[PDB]
Design a protein around this ligand. Structure first.
Ligand code: SF4
Ligand code: SF4
Ligand code: SF4
Ligand SMILES: [Zn+2]
Lengths: 71, 99, 125, 71, 185, 181, 158, 127, 376, 109
């Protein structure tokens, strides 16, 4: 919104916020996850462990991907 | 040539006189160097040099006097080598905050 | 034989190197006789000058004196002797001898180690 | 962790970890001839001097014959 | 290493001017008075067993806290005995220290550089004009109090048809980042 | 100069041992043997093949660890790869990077302003190796000469579009060099 | 103003631009450490003589000044004096980062923050040092820039 | 494009070099990428014909073929096109930089920018 | 009369075309490098040494890293030492080639310039493959190097060494033995060993007279004490003997390069301790302590103990020294940069005395004055 | 050819300057046939992390200072003496005039 319009003026292509909101939450069986950024840990971001006790999806705070516990 | 520090006020005065002599002898060269003959007034230039020397009387340290003479001779060499009613408060106030 | 070249371009081979060295060392001793005896500079000068004079008197050939002294280049030795004469003249011209009394010197010694791969001037063998 | 980064499928100790860096091939390369080899196989000084002198003499003879023909 | 001629010097050198000595693996250090520096360097250069006959360089260090802020350092080398030595003194803005151009002819340009960068004048220099900075430079750049970007900047003035010098008005001011850790001490 | 004169006489006697040697030296100095040899080498290189690169169609070899044009990448999902950690300008020796940031709408830490001077960047790769997330990379592109300094003054949008354009080559180089890390 | 006179003017301008593009005679202003890379550009591999570039040591015969290296307050007057002697058809290529905006010495006394403050530069070549490939790219960009000079048309329509 | 050889002379060199070459690929912009091994020196065994003879530019090489042309990678442009990322990305654009103010890049504060943004970091009272 | 030449400014006093004296004005490339180094962290100050004496890039990095390690006392691994030696000798070859060919062009010989630039382009390709850029590659860091060698580099360097032995033979055949070259060089700007010691000459300009002193043998700062190379000296110091010394130094640099390639070990490329050397990308992305140390080393720097030292290396120009004074902080308090061009350009005055203008330019070429290092 | 009469070209062990594309640089650096593995620590210092013993930066002895007075100076001056074996050794070196092909036949390098 305001932040996106502040750093970008194209207002014709899709901003990263919209893309990251469009990517669906990732369902995982366990209670904790290891968030690395991509398939190669060495090419992603520092490993982030995310707690999934809260019902709502949890943002990774790195490459935010919204992991959600299975049950 | 650079000389040792003057150990006496008389020696410092003699060095000041020598520097003033050098400035006076080098004044006509500055005439052809700069070419401001319309409003130069070589006599006025000599008066201004004397006024600078006279406003630098508050100094009493011979070391400071020698350093000032060294820097003055350096400046002389540089010039020879051609290297260039609303009160005061209200004007600054109208100009900017930082004054 | 005769030395074809001394290697150093500034230095030039001298035929009467032994005689020049003998004269320079004798004059060194005569001049250093004027220095006060308590000073370590005079003691060191007398030591090495007497040693060099003795070896150059005993050995006749310049090759022999170079080999026995271990410094080599009798021309370099002559240059060193002339510089010693100049230094003795200077220390006679100005008087540095004697502690000034109420004198303090701060000797500083730290044993901070350095790695083996930094440039350190290795001692000669 | 170094073991985690350089893990081997069947290693037991931290030693004998896999390693592969740039280095010599088995055999240690070949000599490269640091010195200089300049062969002087040109004609000898006497040979070229004799050639020049004979050329000059025969050429002056030919000049004489040509001058005779032109005359 | 090679602390031979350093110890030999301290054994033979007159004790009058050796204000302090430092035995270190980072370099053997002599600190003396400005009055006797010329004599000390003459002794070292001419003595047969301490022949530091080549002057590596002359440097200046600024210490605003001390009374004599400037520290003049002389790095010398002995190729005959293969060892480096360091001889330094302390000088302030106004006092003139002795020049060693007569002993080491290479010292002229380093002494001019020291004058240029700090303001330490020398007594017997054949000439002491500025060497590195611009003609008509006013300050001494290497002093700690001297601003990094200087006081003036140059530009082309079309009416004057020349490059003029004006007080600094630079955009994108220098951003000093304070990275220092409070637990480093 | 007497020493020089006697050295010259000794050398002349040394190199004039016999008539064969003096004749050979005179002939060599008269017939320009060294000049002829230099000419022959010059002719050999005239007739040998050339090493000219034929610039616009054939370009010089490079390496994946090449420091060309600063650029900003993105995650495969599409979000900006750059958190606002500000390690760029903390390490940038030339201070060519200026960054300002604030919390985004969804609470994510993102940079609201990120500009790099290409007239102040020394092209040293300190930022690309100080990046914890491999966000800024010095791309392989180097033919980006501009007619204006203002054009050479980049910003976040230009860096992001450069990263999007050169994403595939940057990714290949990053894989190859992350092997070497 | 017509359509045939316009075509003739366009042909004349094309010929003039072709001549000026194929006969660029730049002069090196080789300070600091872009000059070595410039000599690499002038070497056998990325040869400049193919495109018509030959370095003229005299500023009076040169076409465009290529300033490569750091511009110092002590040297900027010399740069301006040498630039003023160049003929009226003239161009400037600022190579590197020092000559563009001060580069790695931007926050430094006695350093001109880019040669743009002293002379009007036409093309900047980013890099530190810019690859000889990139410098030759900048020279080709200068050729492209002087490939759209309608001098005859501008003179005609005055 | 062979008539351009007479007034170009550089395309002439390229055509001379494409005698024994093998066309290793072609991009979507028309550039034809050639490779030629065998008795060829190292620096001249890969090249491109830009298919724009009039105004060919060195920046017309797409990033997919840039590495292969510059000898960074052995991967041709087809594999990099296959590996091109999705959900984001822009098409390759040449270094115009002088073809127009509407084409060149402008800062947010530049007067030539279509939308110029003020920079004061404070909001006035604005009665 | 005074004749002025105007980044080399030089005023000459002439009588009969004979140079009575020559005075250089040098400040034209002053950039405040020492002030900026004082204002910047050590890692941020390494590129300044990259820029100083730019013809020989990695020699200055080696000197700076050695000084920092001396003030820091960190052990550099053997593989890092060997690759540093290899690239220092590559740097020496590059600098000698450029110096010789620029000198030849100043004399009048134009053709060896481009052959030696083909060789230099090969070496700069080596630089660009091993590190970021062809020039000013910040590859040598305190505690080791930036990155490991790419695979195949050793084989390529071996091929280059063979072809470069051929090239040095080639260049020596063309230049050495030429009557014009000899007439230009011999008995031009001769220096006695006493004069060189007085004026503080170093490197080729000091070994030309025949002082028989080299830094790599007097104070070996690397595996140099395991490389059994040769150090040439000049019988009578002049331009010709200095040129021959440079040729021999190129040959010995090739020798050292081959030895390093042959006996390079397998191990790590930088200091083991992460307090002084940054951790790898995988380690910082996987380990909490490694992330902390990467963050601290890239915001702050390693805090060297408060001390002052002078570290000198045998740069291709001569003895390049750095005098580092610290105060325990992350930034260097003082950094004096002794370059082996500052003394040689002083030597120009007495070297080009009673000579002519062409002899003056020949002496300048022989001394190989790079103005960046003299204006440090 | 005229250049094989004399000079470096006549030498049988002469190497051409141009490198062939099929033998100089076989694999591009970004596509190498084998994957690297660069060590970053000794095997000992992996599961045995202990920094207070290998802290080479801070594990240095404190600087020692001693203020010598006139009495101490005189004591050392009287105690000390000079012998022929206590003088500093000279770093002596000399030219040899050795042929270029003397070390390894000019091949070994
Ligand atoms: S490459 Fe270096 S100079 Fe350029 S932005 Fe990154 S840290 Fe700064
Ligand atoms: S280091 Fe990386 S994540 Fe941090 S500000 Fe720079 S680009 Fe962004
Ligand atoms: S831009 Fe970089 S390479 Fe060019 S002169 Fe400046 S520091 Fe050197
Ligand atoms: Zn994540």
């Amino acid at each position: 919104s305001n932040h996106t319009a502040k750093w970008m003026q194209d207002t014709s292509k899709k901003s990263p916020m919209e893309l990251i909101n469009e990517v669906p939450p990732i369902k995982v069986e366990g209670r904790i996850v290891a968030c690395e950024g991509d398939t190669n840990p060495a090419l992603g971001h520092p490993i982030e462990f995310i707690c999934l006790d809260l019902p709502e999806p949890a943002v990774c705070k790195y490459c935010g991907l919204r992991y959600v516990q299975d049950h | 040539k650079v000389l040792p520090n003057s150990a006496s006020v008389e020696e410092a005065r003699q060095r000041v006189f020598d520097f003033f002599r050098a400035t006076c002898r080098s004044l006509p060269s500055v005439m052809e160097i700069y070419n401001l003959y319309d409003v130069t007034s070589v006599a006025q230039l000599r008066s201004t040099v004397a006024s600078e020397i006279r406003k630098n009387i508050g100094v009493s340290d011979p070391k400071v006097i020698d350093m000032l003479l060294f820097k003055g001779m350096e400046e002389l060499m540089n010039v020879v080598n051609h290297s260039k009613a609303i009160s005061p408060f209200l004007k600054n106030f109208y100009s900017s905050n930082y004054f | 034989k005769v030395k074809a070249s001394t290697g150093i371009v500034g230095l030039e081979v001298v035929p009467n190197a032994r005689e020049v060295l003998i004269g320079l060392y004798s004059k060194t001793l005569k001049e250093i006789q004027k220095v006060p005896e308590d000073e370590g500079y005079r003691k060191a000068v007398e030591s090495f000058t007497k040693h060099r004079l003795s070896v150059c008197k005993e050995e006749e050939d310049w090759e022999a004196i170079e080999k026995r002294l271990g410094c080599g280049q009798v021309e370099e030795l002559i240059e060193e002797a002339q510089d010693e004469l100049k230094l003795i003249s200077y220390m006679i011209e100005w008087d540095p001898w004697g502690v000034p009394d109420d004198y303090e010197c701060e000797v500083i010694e730290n044993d901070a180690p350095v790695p083996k791969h930094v440039p350190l001037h290795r001692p000669p063998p | 962790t170094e073991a985690y980064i350089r893990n081997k499928p069947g290693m037991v100790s931290v030693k004998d970890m896999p390693v592969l860096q740039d280095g010599p091939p088995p055999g240690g390369f070949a000599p490269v001839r640091f010195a200089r080899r300049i062969p002087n196989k040109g004609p000898s000084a006497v040979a070229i001097f004799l050639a020049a002198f004979g050329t000059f003499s025969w050429g002056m003879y030919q000049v004489g014959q040509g001058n005779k023909i032109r005359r | 290493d090679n602390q031979f001629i350093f110890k030999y010097s301290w054994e033979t050198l007159p004790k009058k001017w050796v204000k302090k000595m430092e035995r270190s693996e980072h370099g053997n250090r002599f600190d003396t008075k400005t009055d006797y520096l010329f004599q000390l360097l003459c002794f070292l250069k001419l003595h047969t067993y301490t022949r530091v006959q080549v002057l590596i360089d002359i440097c200046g260090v600024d210490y605003p806290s001390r009374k004599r802020r400037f520290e003049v350092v002389y790095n010398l080398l002995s190729t005959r005995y293969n060892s480096r030595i360091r001889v330094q003194t302390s000088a302030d803005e106004v006092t003139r220290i002795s020049s060693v151009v007569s002993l080491f002819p290479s010292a002229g340009w380093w002494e001019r550089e020291v004058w240029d960068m700090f303001g330490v004048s020398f007594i017997n220099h054949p000439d002491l004009r500025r060497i590195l900075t611009d003609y008509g430079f006013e300050g001494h750049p290497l002093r700690k109090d001297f601003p990094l970007s200087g006081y003036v900047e140059v530009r082309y003035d079309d009416p004057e048809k020349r490059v003029v010098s004006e007080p600094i008005e630079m955009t994108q001011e220098f951003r000093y980042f304070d990275f220092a850790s409070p637990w480093e001490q | 100069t007497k020493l020089e004169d006697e050295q010259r006489e000794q050398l002349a006697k040394e190199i004039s041992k016999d008539w064969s040697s003096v004749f050979e030296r005179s002939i060599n100095t008269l017939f320009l043997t060294e000049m002829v040899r230099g000419l022959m080498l010059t002719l050999k290189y005239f007739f040998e093949t050339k090493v000219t690169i034929n610039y616009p169609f054939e370009k010089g070899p490079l390496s994946p660890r090449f420091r060309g044009e600063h650029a900003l990448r993105r995650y495969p999902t599409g979000e900006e790869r750059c958190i606002a950690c500000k390690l760029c300008e903390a390490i940038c020796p030339a201070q060519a990077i200026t960054i300002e940031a604030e919390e985004r709408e969804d609470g994510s830490r993102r940079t609201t302003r990120y500009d790099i001077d290409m007239t102040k960047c020394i092209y040293c790769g300190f930022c690309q190796e100080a990046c914890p997330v491999d966000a800024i990379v010095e791309g392989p592109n180097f033919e980006f000469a501009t007619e204006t300094h203002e054009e050479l003054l980049y910003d976040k949008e230009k860096l992001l579009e450069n990263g999007d354009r050169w994403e595939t080559e940057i990714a290949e180089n990053l894989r190859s060099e992350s092997l070497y890390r | 103003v017509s359509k045939a006179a316009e075509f003739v003017i366009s042909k004349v301008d094309d010929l003039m631009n072709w001549a000026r593009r194929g006969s660029i005679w730049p002069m090196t202003f080789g300070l600091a450490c872009c000059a070595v890379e410039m000599m690499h550009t002038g070497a056998a591999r990325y040869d400049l003589d193919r495109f018509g570039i030959i370095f003229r040591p005299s500023p009076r015969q040169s076409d465009c000044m290529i300033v490569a290296g750091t511009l110092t307050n002590k040297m900027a007057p010399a740069l301006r004096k040498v630039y003023d002697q160049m003929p009226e058809p003239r161009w400037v290529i600022s190579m590197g980062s020092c000559a563009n905006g001060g580069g790695y010495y931007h926050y430094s006394y006695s350093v001109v923050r880019g040669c743009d403050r002293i002379v009007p530069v036409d093309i900047y070549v980013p890099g530190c040092p810019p690859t000889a490939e990139a410098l030759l790219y900048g020279l080709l960009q200068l050729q492209k820039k002087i490939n759209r000079r309608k001098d005859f048309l501008h003179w005609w329509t005055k | 494009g062979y008539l351009r050889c007479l007034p170009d002379g550089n395309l002439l060199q390229t055509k001379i070099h494409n005698i024994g070459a093998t066309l290793v690929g072609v991009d979507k912009f028309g550039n034809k990428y050639y490779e030629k091994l065998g008795d060829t020196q190292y620096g001249r065994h890969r090249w491109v014909e830009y298919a724009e003879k009039s105004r060919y530019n060195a920046s017309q090489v797409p990033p997919e073929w840039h590495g292969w042309l510059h000898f960074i990678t052995d991967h041709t442009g087809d594999e990099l096109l296959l590996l091109k990322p999705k959900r984001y990305g822009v098409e390759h654009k040449e270094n115009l930089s002088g073809e127009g103010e509407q084409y060149i890049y402008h800062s947010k504060g530049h007067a030539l920018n279509p939308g110029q943004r003020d920079w004061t970091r404070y909001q006035p009272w604005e009665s | 009369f005074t004749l002025n030449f105007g980044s080399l400014r030089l005023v000459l006093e002439m009588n009969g075309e004979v140079v009575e004296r020559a005075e250089p004005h040098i400040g034209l490339l002053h950039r405040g490098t020492e002030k900026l180094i004082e204002y910047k962290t050590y890692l941020q100050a390494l590129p300044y040494f990259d820029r100083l004496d730019y013809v020989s890039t990695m020699a200055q990095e080696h000197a700076y890293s050695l000084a920092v390690e001396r003030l820091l006392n960190c052990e550099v691994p053997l593989r890092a030492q060997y690759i540093r030696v290899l690239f220092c000798e590559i740097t020496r070859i590059l600098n000698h080639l450029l110096a010789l060919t620029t000198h030849a062009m100043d004399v009048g010989a134009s053709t060896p310039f481009l052959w030696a630039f083909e060789e230099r382009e090969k070496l700069l390709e080596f630089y660009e493959r091993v590190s970021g850029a062809r020039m000013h590659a910040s590859f040598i860091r305190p505690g080791g190097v930036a990155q490991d060698l790419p695979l195949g580099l050793c084989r390529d360097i071996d091929s280059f060494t063979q072809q470069f032995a051929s090239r040095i033979d080639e260049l020596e055949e063309m230049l050495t033995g030429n009557r014009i070259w000899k007439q230009r060089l011999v008995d031009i700007g001769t220096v006695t060993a006493q004069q060189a010691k007085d004026w503080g000459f170093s490197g080729v300009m000091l070994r030309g007279p025949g002082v028989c002193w080299d830094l790599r043998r007097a104070a070996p700062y690397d595996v140099y004490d395991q490389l059994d190379f040769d150090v040439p000296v000049g019988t009578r110091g002049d331009c010709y003997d200095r040129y021959c010394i440079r040729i021999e130094e190129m040959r010995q640099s090739m020798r050292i390069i081959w030895q390093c390639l042959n006996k390079i070990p397998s191990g790590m490329i930088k200091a083991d301790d992460r307090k002084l050397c940054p951790p790898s990308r995988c380690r910082m992305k996987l380990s909490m302590e490694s992330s902390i140390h990467h963050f601290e080393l890239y915001t702050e720097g390693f805090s060297v103990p408060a001390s002052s030292t002078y570290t000198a290396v045998e740069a291709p120009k001569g003895e390049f020294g750095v005098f580092l004074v610290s105060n325990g902080s992350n930034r260097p308090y003082r950094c004096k940069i002794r370059a082996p061009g500052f003394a040689h350009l002083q030597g120009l005055d007495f070297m080009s005395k009673h000579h002519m203008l062409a002899d003056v330019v020949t002496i300048i070429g022989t001394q190989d004055i790079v103005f960046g290092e003299v204006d440090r | 050819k005229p250049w094989e009469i004399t000079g470096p070209c006549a030498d049988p062990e002469y190497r051409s300057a141009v490198p062939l594309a099929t033998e100089y640089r076989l694999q591009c650096p970004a596509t190498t046939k084998e994957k690297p593995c660069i060590p970053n620590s000794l095997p000992e210092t992996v599961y045995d992390i202990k920094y207070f013993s290998r802290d080479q930066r801070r594990n240095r002895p404190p600087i020692r200072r001693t203020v010598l007075k006139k009495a101490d100076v005189e004591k050392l001056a009287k105690e000390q003496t000079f012998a022929v074996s206590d003088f500093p050794p000279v770093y002596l070196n000399s030219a040899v005039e050795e042929d270029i092909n003397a070390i390894g036949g000019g091949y070994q390098g």
